[PDB]
Design a protein around this ligand. Structure first.
Ligand SMILES: CC(=O)N[C@@H]1[C@@H](O[C@@H]2OC(C(=O)O)=C[C@H](O)[C@H]2O)[C@@H](OS(=O)(=O)O)[C@@H](CO)O[C@H]1O
Ligand SMILES: [Mg+2]
Length: 742
């Protein structure tokens, strides 16, 4: 009996929290508030054949999970000290009433599942198990048995068989969560072992489909870049389950578990900036904001999502090694310090158990870590992240592997161009609320920052749901040394005949943006969005313009032909319900500064060059624009885009096909980055088309000897020039070669 009772107790410690004083803030106010929500939920519960709370019918099935969510708040009120309702028998009776009503009317084995599978197999059962676990002694054997039987009906063993469909990645972990608890609570050792075993296929790095990739990428729904939401769900359930089972007969022993720990710093941390997790990896969730069904009324946003991912790291850290835990805690202290948008330590979505874990990290000894300066190219999910002292940026692309966007369940119907070379960024050391402050419900979805698009009007959900629309292109990726990068996207526009070559060269204080082969036949204008910045409500940040630059006060600026540049400052009013059928309808106004180049109607091989300098002063921008020397554009056409930046000793080129640009030649499409440092140089090359066919590179610079080369890099000649052959692989890995110069 005791191994099950011990697991149940350990689950309650994880779920309800441990070793805090309920009288201390902020526990005291969160518990009081839970009491209050419980009291009102109790007062309004109204069992009917089709609902348990008015306005929340069992069809759609969200209305069932909705009901379990409220019974869970009631349960919390009942079992936690400090709530004003702890151990109140009348609260207890109403919980039991609601459970019995759900068990009688909807959540039971005579129901043939309808509507969203997720509500039945993930949303409701995890809550039902949690409630059952918290109230175990008061429930009696028939209720415990009937709760286990319902789980068995909606989540049978076969749901934890084939690693496919609705059972991969975050979904796999969520299914295991309910099956494990049903095993604990129903004293069914085989269900516990099943849930532990079924975690194994989540661990290994994949090269296609759902999961974690060796370059740190994370994919869910087969084609969607998703580290921020699904990746967090996976990380959260894994940490919960590792901690649950540790020390028991069903402890997770798969050594692949280490890959999940590794992913903290390698997959997730780079996407977190001052507490937010970047909207480029948040998929359809960027459209949620205030949800109609959320009794807490907490705005979803990049900051909400990052806070949830920080909380998952805090649970996971409990089972990490000392050295890992020490690094995670230091990064988390850093995020807690720098998040002035939504203070982590009092974040209103957090129950006391997360509050306690984060306060433990806060009070612990050690210094807060900064985000390391560097570049992270998440090539498997067509994402790049760049950090410099002056700014942080996240780029979103799309390819034959990665959808333009996801819409589904009423969410994100206008996200078409979020993958069309969207460049998002924050000025470092300023408030990081750019995309948080009612950005998505007010933005013009036809003018997303960095993108090139047809202005052709599109239908809500155009291209299809769940990541269905992908451009028919291969060359999307880049090459990086870990600090700077060349990134390129062969663009085909969504719902449009637009085609373009877009490149970005991520440097020490700027991103150089090249566009070429811009060709469309839609019969309407084509635009490249130099930027589009949310100014906040009533913003009065000055826009200053010069001959070849523009600067936005508080934000940064752009070097761009001043006569070609179009601008517009305007107020835009919108609501989350405009972009999500499940969100509130309250409307707010945000002022916008938008900047764009008009490529005319039906362009044929149109182009652009512009440089963004996030975080830069007006004067730094005026200097860089008047300086002819700092940057040479080697080539900007549909066969190759390439720059030379002598202050960095840097040459960078995206070769859309075999060709030459400045001192670089390639025999096949490739991305190449050369960096000279005194008497040595390192040459880096990737193959974004991912054919895996060998190609050669020549770099026209005298070279004495090779200090080192990856096993995939064969040296063909040195002397007057460097000549390499590279066997590139099919995941767009960057291969390197270091040489002595003559
Ligand atoms: C990852 C994701 O988008 N999942 C959808 C759910 O949202 C997650 O919900 C939960 C949870 O514990 O219920 C935790 C994650 O933070 C959320 O991102 C959810 O969608 S929604 O209602 O929040 O819009 C469900 C409910 O339908 O659908 C999932 O696909
Ligand atoms: Mg220079």
């Amino acid at each position: 009996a005791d191994p099950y009772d011990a697991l149940r107790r350990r689950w309650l410690g994880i779920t309800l929290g441990t070793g805090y004083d309920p009288a201390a803030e902020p526990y005291a106010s969160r518990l009081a508030e839970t009491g209050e929500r419980a009291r009102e939920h109790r007062a309004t519960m109204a069992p009917t054949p089709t609902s348990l709370w008015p306005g929340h019918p069992f069809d759609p099935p969200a209305g069932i999970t909705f009901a379990y969510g409220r019974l869970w708040t009631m349960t919390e009120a009942y079992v936690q000290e400090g709530t004003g309702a702890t151990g109140d028998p009348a609260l207890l009776a109403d919980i039991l009433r609601g459970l019995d009503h759900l068990s009688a009317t909807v959540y039971h084995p005579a129901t043939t599942r309808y509507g969203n599978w997720w509500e039945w197999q993930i949303g409701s059962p995890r809550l039902l198990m949690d409630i059952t676990a918290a109230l175990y002694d008061h429930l009696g054997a028939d209720r415990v048995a009937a709760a286990c039987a319902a789980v068995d009906h909606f989540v049978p063993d076969a749901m934890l068989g084939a690693y496919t469909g609705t059972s991969t990645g975050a979904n796999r972990v969520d299914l295991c969560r309910s099956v494990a608890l049903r095993g604990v609570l129903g004293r069914a050792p085989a269900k516990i072992a099943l849930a532990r075993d079924a975690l194994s296929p989540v661990f290994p790095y994949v090269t296609k489909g759902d999961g974690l990739y060796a370059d740190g990428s994370f994919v869910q729904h087969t084609w969607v870049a998703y580290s921020g939401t699904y990746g967090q769900v996976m990380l959260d359930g894994l940490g919960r389950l590792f901690t649950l089972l540790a020390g028991s007969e069903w402890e997770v022993t798969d050594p692949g578990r280490q890959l999940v720990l590794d992913s903290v710093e390698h997959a997730y941390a780079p996407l977190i900036h001052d507490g937010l997790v970047m909207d480029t990896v948040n998929g359809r969730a960027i459209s949620r904001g205030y949800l109609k069904s959320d009794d807490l009324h907490v705005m979803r946003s990049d900051h909400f999502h990052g806070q949830q991912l920080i909380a998952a790291m805090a649970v996971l850290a409990g089972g990490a090694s000392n050295a890992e835990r020490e690094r995670w805690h230091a990064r988390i202290k850093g995020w807690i310090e720098r998040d002035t948008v939504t203070p982590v330590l009092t974040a209103p979505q957090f129950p006391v158990a997360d509050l306690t874990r984060l306060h433990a990290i806060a009070d612990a000894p050690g210094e807060a870590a900064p985000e390391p300066v560097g570049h992270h190219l998440f090539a498997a999910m067509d994402r790049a992240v760049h950090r410099r002292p002056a700014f942080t940026a996240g780029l979103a692309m799309a390819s034959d592997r990665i959808a333009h966007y996801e819409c589904g369940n009423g969410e994100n119907p206008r996200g078409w161009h979020t993958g069309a070379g969207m460049l998002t960024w924050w000025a470092n050391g300023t408030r990081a609320d750019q995309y948080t402050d009612w950005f998505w419900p007010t933005v013009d979805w036809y003018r997303l920052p960095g993108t090139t698009v047809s202005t052709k009007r599109l239908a809500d959900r155009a291209g299809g749901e769940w990541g269905a629309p992908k451009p028919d292109v291969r060359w999307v990726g880049g090459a990086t040394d870990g600090e700077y990068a060349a990134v390129g996207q062969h663009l085909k526009g969504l719902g449009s005949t637009l085609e373009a070559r877009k490149s970005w060269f991520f440097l020490d204080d700027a991103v150089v943006c090249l566009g070429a082969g811009i060709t469309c036949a839609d019969g309407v204008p084509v635009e490249t969005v130099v930027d589009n910045r949310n100014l906040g409500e009533g913003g009065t940040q000055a826009l200053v313009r010069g001959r070849h630059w523009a600067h936005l006060e508080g934000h940064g600026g752009w070097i761009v032909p001043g006569g070609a540049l179009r601008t517009l400052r305007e107020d835009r009013t919108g609501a989350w319900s405009d972009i999500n059928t499940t969100s509130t309808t309250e409307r707010r106004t945000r002022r916008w500064q938008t900047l764009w180049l008009d490529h005319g109607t039906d362009p044929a091989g149109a182009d652009y060059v512009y440089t963004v300098m996030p975080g830069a002063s007006r004067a730094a921008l005026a200097r860089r624009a008047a300086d002819r020397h700092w940057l040479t554009v080697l080539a900007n056409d549909d066969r190759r885009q390439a720059v030379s930046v002598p202050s960095l000793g840097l040459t960078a080129a995206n070769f859309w096909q075999a060709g030459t640009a400045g001192p670089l030649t390639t025999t096949a499409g490739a991305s190449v980055l050369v960096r000279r440092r005194g008497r040595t140089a390192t040459l880096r090359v990737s193959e974004p088309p991912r054919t895996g066919e060998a190609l050669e590179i020549v770099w026209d610079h005298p070279v004495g000897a090779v200090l080192r080369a990856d096993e995939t890099v064969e040296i063909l000649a040195t002397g007057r020039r460097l000549h390499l052959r590279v066997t590139p692989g099919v995941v767009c890995t960057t291969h390197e070669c270091e040489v002595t110069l003559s």
